[PDB]
Design a protein around this nucleic acid. Structure first.
Ligand SMILES: [Ca+2]
Lengths: 476, 102, 407
RNA sequence: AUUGUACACGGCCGAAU
DNA sequence: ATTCGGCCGTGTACAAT
């Protein structure tokens, strides 16, 4: 008595109203949704003189075009066009003179010469942040800064081997600490390992010391990296195509992250809504509340103050409260949360609201007859609980990009929800195509849920009560 | 302006200029590859502002695509377009070659 | 049975005959779908290897006779809005059987009108060797995908419907939890673990008086009521006992074939003998075998087919989920220390066919378990307390183009 | 950390005995 | 102690049959 469904691939919007189901093809034909005023994206580079020169050649190399890494599947592994009429971003990625800061060989030896791994990461962050402050206040003002870490620095910071004895195992993450400690800088930063802009480079894995890491083909790496660079430059590449007769809706994803002590649990939230006109806003905020514990769920007061904050952010762009508010959460909605959220809606006069728990650990799954799994977008209704396959066989790609069979997303709406699960699944599936961190659209999790977790990693190192930018470009 | 040149007809036999004008816009690429280019056809996406200018024009307008790498020239009437999208043109490498044969 | 089944459905059957002798492939697709009804691929007559070029076909049937504006030059047929990939719109006559194809990559100004198929140059003859082949598209750099336009597929689900007995025995006890009462049970005879104790209450699908659990249960307070008052109720505790009772009943059942890991929640096949291979015989509508409890050939370690059996309540009905997994042992009984490399190695290689086969195996094992042997006391005089049954296949509306993909 | 999935391992939380 | 539910965190393998 389970009713099946296969949703069509949601249409994305590019360029001057162009529509396509694939971010790569849509960008290739129509270009970015928000075109830049100017044909150059000034990219600053921080790293050793080898990596700074190495990455700069890579940026020019992408301008000349990169041959596809697998011609058998030309949709899953397409070739980067270049600077022709097929330019995905209609702009030039150049490094202007004076926009490079060189990490001297002496400075690398200071970081590598420290015994304790934690001290090395902290010392490296201060060293990099000082160089980062030099770039922003200089004459050459970049739009996005690329940190091309050298191989010896990656060995010390990531693999920690150059290792000391393990003390608890909660080793600091250099990327998250660096992103948090430079949140006050006005320009977003991007970390790029040498093996992505140079196929010759090889960094061994941390534990498996005898094996290098395996990376995607060069064309795919250029696609994902430059798309992130374009987004961090201050423009939205693509947006979901809006239905003409749709309720003005705001999506709010709620997630949790362990505190640095490893025991307490904080709440990190992300909000998605399209501004008036052709645009899409992705905010990342932490609930300004003091109720500390280990519970992976919110309290009645905590949820109410959180929803009120999200509504106010929406009202700043639209000057009117949203018609619909869809709240996606990584854990089951409890009674205190639902009544807390409903209290916030009543004060703001919100008409309809959906409370959906996006569970990934559900063991329920379906299997078609063959060697490939079910189509992406397959939906099965289980007495209200929705089984959605955001990952699976993609007809556009011609294959299924995964190792084992995909694990479907189980959507469990709370009883205090308006829309049917079929309607919610169509929105959840559509939300997976606006992550902007990758050009491959068969993403498993919806963007508000995913964006909430990405914000959480950075905010573990930001002390509570410190005001930080809500722009998602500083966390992706 | 919107157009890059004007073609004026002339009878090849008597040499008399017929006086009929024809607007021409030329897009030049260097070793590029048009969107979804097979060995017999390809496509092209017109800018929305170009369409608005061409509608107001009082003379016919053709769009000519020139590639320096292979010295290939293709042409198509701007009003002619794919039935689906107003901004999309489907060129055929056999019938749309820009040359004295056309 | 549609009114057009005689005409529309069987119309495409005769169209394939023209292409069958021509030598071009015809791949079945959706009947009334947007864009294609069949696929044409050029092929080399000498070898038959694929050439990597495709083309779609759409056919719509009509009645016998002529159409609007038909003299002895051509006719005039309209194309309805609901039908990328350019496709030939092949027609079909009934008075004298003359098919009429026409392209869609062609641009006669705007195509938004009536497609007047010519009666002189739109005849679908074996001349399509180079004529139709000129239009065929390729799966190279432009990136033409194969949209799924099919009658869908039949997918199976992990759920098995559980039919609980119409009666359940509920009784009090001077014990709080089963752990507090298990030492009381073991010292007596006729030991049976298929029961749950919580809140000083005793729940079991069997009558406690008949079997050896008389010591724990208050033998005068054994009352049998319907399961709808204990299982299908909103009480959170009652759900938890039902979760406990279902597993233990499944645990005691199938004991001839499976073993339970206490630290985990994993069911796995037990090994007959010591450190030797094994096999199982399960249904598909076919007889299939598989190494359920298999010792390796390269070394001596033993891998047992495993599954995490969990119960869910959907639509006021109880279902059992099957989650395939593996359990590795040095000799079939002692758990294999450091099994991460072996466990992760096998998981990395399985695909949809492998996991589906494992699910069907566990479905067959449980559904056959509820059945009784013909002879009395062959396995147990009372019938198995749980009856499972496969759910009807899930009818997806779209099919994976597995045939079009490699292999 | 271009990108994510699958897997493995570990920690922890909610309800009642 | 159990039985049921769940969640977040760090690594390797792989680029998809
Ligand atoms: Ca990123």
């Amino acid at each position: 008595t389970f009713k099946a469904h296969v949703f069509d691939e949601p249409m994305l919007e590019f360029g001057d109203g162009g529509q396509h189901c694939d971010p790569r093809q849509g960008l290739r034909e129509h270009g970015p949704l928000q075109p830049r005023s100017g044909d150059v994206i000034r990219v600053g580079v921080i790293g050793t003189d080898d990596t700074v020169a190495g990455f700069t050649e890579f940026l020019a190399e992408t301008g000349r075009g990169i041959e596809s890494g697998n011609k058998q599947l030309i949709n899953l592994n397409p070739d980067f066009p270049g600077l022709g009429n097929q330019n995905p971003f209609r702009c030039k990625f150049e490094v202007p003179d004076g926009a490079t800061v060189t990490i001297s060989r002496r400075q690398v030896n200071d970081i590598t010469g420290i015994g304790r791994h934690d001290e090395a990461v902290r010392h490296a962050v201060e060293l990099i942040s000082s160089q980062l402050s030099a770039l922003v206040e200089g004459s050459a003002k970049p739009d996005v800064i690329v940190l091309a870490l050298p191989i010896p620095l990656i060995e010390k910071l990531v693999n920690a081997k150059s290792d000391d004895d393990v003390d608890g195992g909660d080793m600091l993450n250099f990327r998250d600490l660096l992103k948090a400690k430079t949140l006050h800088l006005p320009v977003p930063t991007q970390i790029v390992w040498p093996d992505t802009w140079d196929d010759a480079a090889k960094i061994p894995r941390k534990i498996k010391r005898d094996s290098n890491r395996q990376t995607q083909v060069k064309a795919t790496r250029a696609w994902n990296l430059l798309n992130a660079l374009f987004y961090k430059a201050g423009k939205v590449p693509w947006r979901l195509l809006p239905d003409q007769a749709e309720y003005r809706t705001s999506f709010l994803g709620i997630g949790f992250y362990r505190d640095l002590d490893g025991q307490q649990l904080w709440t990190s939230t992300a909000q998605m809504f399209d501004e008036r006109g052709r645009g899409l806003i992705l905010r990342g905020a932490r609930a300004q509340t003091e109720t500390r514990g280990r519970h992976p769920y919110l309290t009645a007061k905590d949820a109410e103050d959180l929803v009120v904050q999200s509504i106010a952010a929406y009202k700043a762009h639209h000057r009117h409260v949203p018609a619909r508010l869809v709240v996606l959460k990584t854990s089951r909605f409890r009674s205190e949360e639902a009544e807390g959220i409903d209290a916030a809606l009543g004060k703001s006069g919100i008409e309809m609201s959906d409370l959906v728990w996006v569970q990934e650990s559900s063991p329920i799954a379906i299997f078609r007859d063959g060697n490939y799994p079910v189509l992406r977008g397959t939906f099965v209704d289980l007495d209200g609980k929705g089984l959605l396959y955001t990952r699976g066989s993609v007809p556009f790609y011609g294959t299924f990009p995964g190792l084992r069979v995909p694990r479907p997303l189980l959507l469990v709406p709370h009883e205090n929800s308006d829309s049917t699960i079929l309607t919610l699944a169509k929105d959840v599936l559509a939300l997976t195509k606006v992550n902007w961190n990758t050009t491959q659209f068969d993403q498993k999790l919806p963007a508000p849920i995913k964006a909430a977790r990405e914000v959480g990693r950075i905010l573990k190192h930001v002390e509570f009560g410190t005001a930080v930018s809500s722009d998602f470009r500083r966390y992706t | 302006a919107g157009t890059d040149g004007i073609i004026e007809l002339r009878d090849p036999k008597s040499g008399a200029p017929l006086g009929k004008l024809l607007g021409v816009q030329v897009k030049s690429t260097e070793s590029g590859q048009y969107v979804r280019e097979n060995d017999n056809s390809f496509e092209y996406l017109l800018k929305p502002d170009d369409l608005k200018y061409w509608r107001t024009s009082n003379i016919p307008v053709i769009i000519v695509l020139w590639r320096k790498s292979d010295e290939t020239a293709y042409w198509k009437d701007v009003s002619d377009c794919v039935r689906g999208e107003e901004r999309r043109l489907k060129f055929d490498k056999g019938t749309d070659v820009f040359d004295p044969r056309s | 049975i549609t009114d057009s089944q005689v005409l529309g459905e069987l119309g495409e059957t005769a169209i394939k005959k023209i292409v069958l002798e021509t030598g071009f492939l015809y791949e079945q697709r959706g009947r009334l779908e947007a864009g294609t009804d069949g696929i044409i691929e050029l092929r080399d007559p000498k070898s038959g290897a694929p050439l990597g070029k495709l083309l779609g076909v759409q056919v719509k049937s009509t009645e016998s006779g002529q159409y609007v504006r038909e003299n002895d030059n051509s006719f005039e047929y309209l194309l309805k809005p609901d039908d990328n990939i350019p496709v030939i719109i092949v027609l079909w006559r009934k008075s004298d059987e003359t098919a009429y194809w026409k392209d869609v990559s062609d641009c006669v100004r705007g195509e938004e009108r009536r497609l007047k198929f010519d009666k002189g140059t739109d005849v679908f003859d074996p001349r399509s060797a180079d004529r139709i082949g000129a239009l065929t598209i390729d799966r190279r750099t432009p990136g033409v995908f194969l949209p799924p336009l099919n009658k869908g597929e039949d997918a199976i689900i992990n759920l098995l419907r559980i039919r609980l007995p119409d009666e359940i025995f509920i009784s009090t006890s001077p014990f709080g939890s089963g752990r507090d009462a298990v030492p009381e049970l073991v010292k007596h005879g006729n030991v049976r673990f298929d029961w749950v104790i919580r809140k000083r209450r005793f729940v079991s699908f069997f009558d406690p008086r008949e079997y050896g659990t008389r010591a724990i249960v208050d033998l005068d307070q054994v009352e049998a009521v319907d399961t709808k008052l204990i299982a299908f109720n909103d009480e959170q505790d009652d759900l938890n006992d039902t979760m406990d009772l279902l597993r233990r009943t499944v645990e005691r059942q199938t004991a001839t074939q499976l073993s339970f890991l206490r630290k985990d929640r994993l069911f796995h096949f037990k090994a007959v003998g010591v450190g030797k291979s094994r096999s199982y015989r399960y249904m598909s509508a076919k007889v299939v075998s598989a190494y359920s409890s298999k010792k390796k050939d390269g070394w001596g370690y033993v891998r047992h087919h495993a599954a995490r059996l969990r119960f869910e309540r959907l639509a006021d009905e109880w279902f059992l989920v099957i989650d395939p997994d593996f359990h590795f042992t040095t000799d079939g009984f002692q758990p294999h220390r450091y099994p991460e490399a072996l466990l992760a190695g096998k998981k990395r290689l399985e695909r949809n066919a492998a996991v589906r086969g494992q699910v069907t195996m566990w479905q067959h094992l449980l559904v056959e378990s509820g059945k009784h042997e013909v002879g009395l006391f062959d396995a147990d005089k009372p019938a198995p307390l749980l009856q499972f049954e496969r759910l009807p296949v899930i009818q997806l509306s779209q099919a994976v183009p597995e045939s079009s993909w490699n292999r």
